[PDB]
Design a protein around this ligand. Structure first.
Ligand SMILES: Nc1nc2c(ncn2[C@@H]2O[C@H](COP(=O)(O)OP(=O)(O)O)[C@@H](O)[C@H]2O)c(=O)[nH]1
Ligand SMILES: Nc1nc2c(ncn2[C@@H]2O[C@H](COP(=O)(O)OP(=O)(O)O)[C@@H](O)[C@H]2O)c(=O)[nH]1
Ligand SMILES: Nc1nc2c(ncn2[C@@H]2O[C@H](COP(=O)(O)OP(=O)(O)O)[C@@H](O)[C@H]2O)c(=O)[nH]1
Ligand SMILES: *C(=O)CCCCCCCCCCCCCCC
Ligand SMILES: *C(=O)CCCCCCCCCCCCCCC
Ligand SMILES: *C(=O)CCCCCCCCCCCCCCC
Ligand SMILES: *[C@@H]1O[C@H](CO)[C@@H](O)[C@H](O)[C@H]1NC(C)=O
Ligand SMILES: *[C@@H]1O[C@H](CO)[C@@H](O)[C@H](O)[C@H]1NC(C)=O
Ligand SMILES: *[C@@H]1O[C@H](CO)[C@@H](O)[C@H](O)[C@H]1NC(C)=O
Ligand SMILES: *[C@@H]1O[C@H](CO)[C@@H](O)[C@H](O)[C@H]1NC(C)=O
Ligand SMILES: *[C@@H]1O[C@H](CO)[C@@H](O)[C@H](O)[C@H]1NC(C)=O
Ligand SMILES: *[C@@H]1O[C@H](CO)[C@@H](O)[C@H](O)[C@H]1NC(C)=O
Ligand code: NA
Ligand SMILES: [Zn+2]
Ligand SMILES: [Zn+2]
Ligand SMILES: [Zn+2]
Ligand SMILES: [Zn+2]
Ligand SMILES: [Zn+2]
Ligand SMILES: [Zn+2]
Lengths: 540, 540, 540
């Protein structure tokens, strides 16, 4: 089957010389192409995209003076050795110095007072307390008494954060941010600090958007926050570094975009401790006693959130995108074929054109549909075609007769490409077995009148022995047969001559049923000496 | 070429009125559509997805009492100022106090004893030691001697972590987790704490799955771990916050899912220090000497792993997905066309239907294949068609003759749409040049018998001068020619009349080869007065 | 419309028995299939990919001796309790001990000297200073005077980092890295340490590439850096853990790849403080005074960057990819159809084949194009076809005549499938209204000569009453009509007989325009007794 495989199958097409459909087809082609090109370029769908790998190094600069005598805060005093994605700047603080692990009364709170030891419970762990009770109601001061606890003593008082913030001059502090980013898939590395950047720059949204030295108060202004107010209880501020990087040589750009967003929830419910603070202890020994200064530090935690993508041209990405948009170029074909199949219907003239006469020249689709689509029937064993000489159409009786004569069984109308049922006076009763008799109980005409076998052309197109012999010799020029063999060939050829004449197409002539008058006239002209006639047999 | 471009080409189609193929085609259309719709909706393939940008703020609450007198541990004692993605809770500890940078003997280990200075090596750095040897085997105690080292003295003893853990009451500690998440591409921000959440809630997998206050022991229970056992040597616990967020207005939901997973490897080999611990020093001065208390802290490091995606409807994402699934609607066409092309073969009746008679009504595909596919031959210069009057088929001799007469060169069988090689007694030797003689050495019949030129229709269809003149005038109604011009046109028309009659289609009649008898009978009826006959020439 | 929906439409195709096109079609099919398969397998486009969730635990090991007497540095002295994605190793340091919050002169800098109090400014905050000026120029030493500041005193001197680094023996330190990774979507967890790994291993790029114990100097060597030189001022070193993980059972592999990259910028401008350092303070009390030792620590920050993807087979991913590459199998059809449509043009023989005769056997595409494409015209109301008996082509006059006789209005040439304008002497003036007269002002021939109505076949094909009656009876075998009805049917049938004869196809015969001579000869043979002749009317 080497020749069976080496074959090419091409579609048969009808090329229409129509300027309307040629223009519509090309207009739809540009619309699809314009959107496909726009989607590819705007979304960089030809690029293989990769998340960024970031490293952040921060350096805070600034000195603070706190009036309380005067204490100095440099970077070692309000910051911590961490210089990565997060750094903390202390803006407020409460101190409780000289704490010793011993027994002491609780600080008087909203419910920390007691009047008897029955109120205190030994081993109890008050969620708002920093010690474990011993069940003793010792005196805190002269006025009131509080339950004794095991804790660092004296316990930290429920003192609010100072207002204004002790280190609110941190607004004028600056942080330098060094961001190293990398794309391991594309093997590309860059940093946020350009060689042109000087140390005297400060970030501005419009004047210096690439300087990575930020004033803290400027950061808060750009986020819509008030540094002075947030400094009292603290908060979390997000410094977002966005990297939209194009690594293609012809459109190369890998630069950061700086934005600022508060990550603290200012509407935090009071039970969740709004703001940002933590407690840390400075441990020291004094008089052979382990002492501790406890500091509740308020301030801003700055989170450096670095995100972004690096794209570079990928051939496989482009191939996948192009293949995923190739089917959209069939839109013009779908639309115009729908127009052809829809405007070729008979309800167009019946119930559309009289209303709207602007659509009148769309009758050309009836011609287009004729040249495009050919309808065929499934050749089932019960497929029958009936033509009546007194009718302009052809009936298709595709159902089983079930003993009803074919004359009375009406079928679907199809355009042409002595017995009780007889209406011409020439038909004869079927000589088939009684089960199949209803097939041959067909007349040449539906309504009474002249028989078709009495027409001039019936003797010329069907019964002429010379013409049938000429057709037989056209099939086989050197043909010698006996009378019995010749009669059978002439009889079967006369059936086809009637079927072709009255039904036109061989598709319908194959399942055409001869009327009884015509069938028996043919059988009289070319008789069968011995045996009975088979009748119509299913061609498949 | 304005009219050349403004054209529309449509496919020629055969519409089959078959309920089986119409049902199969629609059933396959629903199957493709059902899967395409299901894949799009279940996977949200219409959405542009974005990784989350997360910020975590944690607050641990709890007080611990350690029995050793009694020491108090509050958050400043077992936690560190870090409150981001990681926080540490100390659950056990070993202390070595009053260390001084001086010379001291090594602690007695499995191989730290010595009996001579030759065992010790000056400057040696034992991997299991905390000092550098000086080559001297000083006495540690009365029983044994150990190598002298430069270290903080005395060196920390090889003491195991206490069992049970000193701060195993950390099981009852709680952590509040504040998670701020953001989708910069979609510009959406939310947090894990809803306004409905109260401070008295505790997380439960089924009762309070949205409360972000977690008991540490509950975290360990939900991970399948035992807090009490892990507390002795420490470990790493992962708190996973998963954000499956739909940002479409009609299906909006952005809420976290909490899961817990141990990140420590409990099956760690002993050389890799299983558990979690670190050594830190509390530095202080005493008697003008730089002293240090060294603490080996065991405990749980909690990692807050926040991940997830935020999806919102994207038109370009939907267009790409739809275009990438449009080709699947050709599946019905492919399947039914395969059925038509396969069940139309002759081996169906030969070796399939006798076995299985259920497939018998599939003979309709032979009719479908006839109305769908037309087979044509490549018109190569060696393409020849031969018809023998005593055969029912037509031979295609597509090979070069190479001096073998065309009568004997057998070719592929194709259905019809005096010389030694002669078998009819009427053929004449070719008058062509000897190289091309084998072309015209063809008889009308394969086996001996009557010549086709003696048939009645040969004189009527091929030789009739009146009919050929009528055909010529049909071509050109007003045609005047001399006898030499008329004879040439009549002779060439008689070749085509024979070729059309004996081969049917003009595709095969173009390459049909006339038998010598017919060719010379035609040339006798319409002779060429001067010159020689060209013979058959390749039409392309 | 149950039968209207249950229909199947198949394309009509031409199957070409060509080995060249069959081979080209299959070769292009393998090329598309080979690339589609290669792209799918190399890029794992059948897999659903997921970013990794990582947890890192590090442990640094090593002791350092610093010569300054001799001070010992163990992990508590050069590292910090952080053991996650970042750890710091101190390699150099400058100490300023015994600092007290008081008033002191500034350290003499390049511009810190003063000669009068007018130079100093009270409250000034020098960016290079660690205090706030009080406007007083106190003496620092005997030689020079500096402005008094409020700071920790004495202020840290502008001392360079020691060279060589004090803790450059950190080169021989080792870090053990434990990496737990997870794929929450695929529910897969693994770690970087295999059970086969022993504690005596050290990482080597080729000898032990899976051991996660790294010498720091080896890390710097693998990054192309010098640990000894970087140790003086510090730097940031990236340890990259790449996880290319295949989670399919038949190709399972999830192992890390270790690479090293310096994240510090060695070419940093001096104003941005190149290297890596931070200042931290050791707070202590002495003589009831809050004292502090300030250390400027230089060293290497190591960032553990863990990235990667985990892929597992996804059915929806495969379906989307296959559907997005199905349209590429139409490439063979597009190419071969382009070959057929292009090599069938007449400029091939005119201006291509004489130059290149290798392309000569490509004339078979003219035959292929004939069997594939049928061209039809849009049936517009101004569509006219004209045939002249003295011409070999047929003119298409698709434009409006606008009073110009159809004889003179030339149209496009189309191959056949008494009055002043008359050139045959038999034409008659039109009897139509004057506006439409130009339609019927057409002669049978362009140039003077014999009329076509004087031909023998005109009386046989057009005027023969017997033949027209036979055609009428073929339409309707039992037809009885009056002379007026018979004449109208015979006249209209004779128009079609002329149009079919002279134009061939019914597509062109529908819009064919009869010459005046033929029209009036037909109207003379079959006259209209009463009324006037309608003439040609638009068939649509
Ligand atoms: N289409 C069609 N074919 C028929 C009809 N009647 C008979 N035939 C065909 O005639 C052939 C032989 O039928 P018949 O002459 O009655 O049987 P026979 O005398 O034994 O050969 C069969 O192949 C039938 O297909 C008819 O009404 N319509
Ligand atoms: N198909 C076919 N055509 C033939 C054959 N023999 C001759 N012809 C055609 O007849 C035409 C003229 O051949 P011929 O009459 O022998 O040469 P002429 O007398 O010089 O015109 C050529 O165009 C041939 O294509 C044949 O056997 N088969
Ligand atoms: N194609 C074509 N059809 C024509 C021409 N002239 C007349 N007819 C057709 O002839 C039919 C009747 O025209 P005519 O005999 O002149 O009018 P009538 O005598 O009133 O029936 C119309 O349907 C026309 O389509 C012609 O030149 N070309
Ligand atoms: C009557 O049918 C003749 C009309 C000829 C022009 C038809 C134009 C129809 C409008 C375009 C329809 C296809 C586009 C559909 C949207 C993609
Ligand atoms: C004989 O061929 C007649 C059978 C008519 C119904 C054919 C049904 C075949 C089963 C469906 C085949 C196409 C689906 C293939 C799987 C996608
Ligand atoms: C003349 O046209 C006959 C040539 C027969 C073989 C044609 C081969 C052409 C080369 C292949 C063209 C299609 C591939 C285009 C690149 C994808
Ligand atoms: C910030 O600096 C400016 C100018 O140096 C000063 O006017 C302002 O008071 C400062 N803000 C704070 C909060 O100290
Ligand atoms: C910031 O908040 C403080 C209160 O702490 C207020 O006095 C000040 O006016 C605010 N600044 C602005 C610009 O609103
Ligand atoms: C946790 O608390 C419960 C009730 O307060 C107590 O019974 C239990 O012993 C505690 N667990 C530890 C480890 O302290
Ligand atoms: C947890 O481990 C401890 C050992 O440290 C054991 O005594 C206790 O029974 C364990 N708890 C459970 C629930 O298994
Ligand atoms: C590292 O160790 C080797 C061998 O122990 C030694 O020779 C070398 O001097 C050491 N390097 C440093 C910087 O101490
Ligand atoms: C590393 O740098 C030091 C300078 O600090 C230099 O002495 C040494 O030779 C360098 N090592 C190499 C291998 O270049
Ligand atoms: Na497609
Ligand atoms: Zn009858
Ligand atoms: Zn009848
Ligand atoms: Zn012969
Ligand atoms: Zn012969
Ligand atoms: Zn004329
Ligand atoms: Zn004329």
């Amino acid at each position: 089957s080497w020749n069976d495989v080496l074959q090419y199958e091409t579609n048969k097409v009808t090329r229409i010389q129509s300027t309307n459909y040629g223009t519509v087809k090309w207009v739809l082609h540009m619309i699809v192409f314009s959107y496909i090109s726009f989607a590819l370029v705007s979304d960089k769908l030809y690029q293989r995209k990769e998340p960024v790998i970031s490293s952040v190094h921060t350096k805070v600069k600034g000195i603070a003076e706190v009036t309380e005598g005067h204490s100095i805060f440099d970077t070692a005093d309000y910051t911590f050795p961490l210089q990565g994605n997060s750094f903390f700047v202390m803006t407020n603080y409460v101190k409780s110095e000289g704490q010793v692990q011993t027994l002491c009364p609780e600080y008087p709170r909203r419910g920390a007072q007691c009047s008897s030891d029955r109120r205190c419970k030994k081993g109890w762990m008050d969620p708002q307390s920093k010690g474990i009770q011993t069940g003793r109601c010792v005196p805190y001061d002269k006025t009131r008494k509080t339950c004794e606890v095991s804790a660092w003593c004296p316990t930290e008082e429920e003192k609010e954060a100072p207002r204004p913030a002790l280190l609110r001059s941190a607004e004028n502090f600056t942080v330098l941010i060094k961001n190293n980013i990398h794309f391991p898939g594309h093997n590309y590395t860059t940093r946020n600090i350009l060689p042109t950047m000087n140390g005297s720059c400060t970030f501005h949204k419009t004047w210096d958007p690439q300087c990575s030295i930020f004033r803290l108060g400027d950061i808060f202004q750009e986020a819509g926050e008030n540094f002075t107010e947030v400094a009292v209880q603290g908060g979390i501020m997000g410094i977002e570094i966005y990297w939209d990087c194009n690594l293609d040589s012809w459109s190369h750009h890998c630069r950061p975009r700086y934005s600022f967003r508060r990550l603290d929830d200012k509407n935090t419910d009071e039970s969740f401790v709004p703001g940002y603070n933590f407690r840390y202890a400075k441990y020291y020994k004094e008089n052979n006693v382990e002492k501790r200064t406890l500091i509740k530090a308020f301030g801003i935690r700055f989170d450096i959130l670095v995100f972004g993508t690096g794209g570079k041209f990928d051939i496989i990405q482009l191939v996948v995108y192009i293949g995923s948009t190739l089917s959209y170029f069939g839109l013009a074909t779908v639309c115009i074929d729908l127009l052809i199949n829809t405007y070729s219907s008979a309800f167009c003239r019946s119930g559309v054109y009289p209303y709207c006469k602007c659509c009148e020249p769309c009758t050309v689709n009836e011609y287009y549909y004729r040249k495009k689509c050919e309808s065929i029937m499934e050749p089932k064993p019960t497929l029958k075609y009936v033509s009546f000489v007194d009718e302009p159409h052809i009936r298709m009786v595709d159902q089983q007769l079930l003993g009803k004569s074919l004359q009375v069984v009406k079928g679907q109308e199809v355009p042409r490409p002595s017995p009780s049922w007889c209406q011409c006076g020439n038909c004869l009763p079927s000589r088939l077995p009684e089960q199949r008799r209803a097939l041959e109980e067909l007349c040449c005409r539906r309504k009474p009148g002249r028989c078709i076998t009495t027409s001039k052309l019936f003797h010329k197109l069907v019964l002429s022995r010379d013409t049938l012999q000429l057709l037989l010799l056209y099939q086989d020029p050197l043909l010698v047969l006996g009378e019995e063999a010749t009669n059978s060939r002439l009889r079967h050829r006369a059936y086809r001559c009637y079927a072709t004449w009255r039904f036109g197409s061989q598709d319908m002539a194959d399942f055409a049923i001869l009327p009884s008058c015509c069938r028996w006239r043919i059988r009289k002209e070319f008789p069968k000496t011995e045996g009975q006639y088979s009748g119509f047999k299913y061609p498949y």
